[PDB]
């Protein structure tokens, strides 16, 4: 996250870290047994780390559970990043408490201008690399279709929304991928792609979760 702030410890209880020797992507807990992330974060073996704040130190509230099943969307397109969504089933249920909780799925898509909260442990520098140990937060609005499509001509599908600032300086970056965008208590976006990070006129592009509730539900019921 570029141009964010350090989140209060355990103030984003649905945030998870996907680990394969080290942190590589974020995710969101939507059920005690299921985590939603981005398909381009796919890896064969994944350990899901809940209850994290400082990923470099054991604090005592963590629950590390390995992924039992990893299901990428059947229509994910690696070229366009359409349908950039993946579901991970935990080998054992997470225990829900003050530090580990689920985030609601959207009841409807969000209005333009809706204030959201984005979080992750991705790169924090606009020039160079710097991965934080402490979870970062960023408040950003959902941009209209117009501003989103004018920013990326012919590259925005109906399964994508832009969230951020056209002036740059504030955005999600590498390492935040798969992470949550929560607006009014509902998971509206998944960190997906963009042209770089925090560049002017190039806001982050996110998977539009409100189109996938049926797929999520059907998949969880089937597995």
């Amino acid at each position: 996250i570029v141009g964010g702030y350090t989140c209060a410890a355990n103030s984003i209880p649905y945030q998870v870290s996907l680990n394969s020797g080290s942190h590589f992507c974020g995710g969101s807990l939507i059920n005690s047994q299921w985590v939603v992330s981005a398909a381009h974060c796919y890896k064969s073996r994944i350990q899901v780390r809940l209850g994290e704040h400082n990923i470099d130190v054991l604090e005592g509230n963590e629950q590390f559970i390995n992924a039992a099943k990893i299901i990428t969307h059947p229509n994910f397109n690696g070229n366009t990043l359409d349908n950039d969504i993946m579901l991970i089933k935990l080998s054992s249920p997470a225990t829900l408490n003050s530090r580990v909780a689920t985030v609601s799925l959207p009841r409807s898509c969000a209005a333009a201008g809706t204030e959201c909260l984005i979080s992750g442990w991705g790169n924090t520098k606009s020039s160079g690399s710097s991965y934080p140990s402490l979870l970062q937060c960023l408040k950003a609005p959902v941009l209209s279709d117009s501003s989103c499509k004018s920013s990326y001509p012919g590259q925005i599908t109906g399964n994508m929304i832009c969230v951020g600032f056209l002036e740059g300086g504030k955005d999600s970056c590498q390492g935040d991928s798969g992470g949550p965008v929560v607006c009014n208590g509902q998971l509206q976006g998944i960190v997906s792609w963009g042209y770089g990070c925090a560049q002017k006129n190039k806001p982050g592009v996110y998977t539009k979760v409100c189109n996938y509730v049926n797929w999520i539900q059907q998949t969880i019921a089937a597995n």
Partner: peptide, 7 residues
């Protein structure tokens, strides 16, 4: 660090 595999 802490918790293991299998799987």
């Amino acid at each position: 660090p802490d918790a293991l595999a299998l799987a």
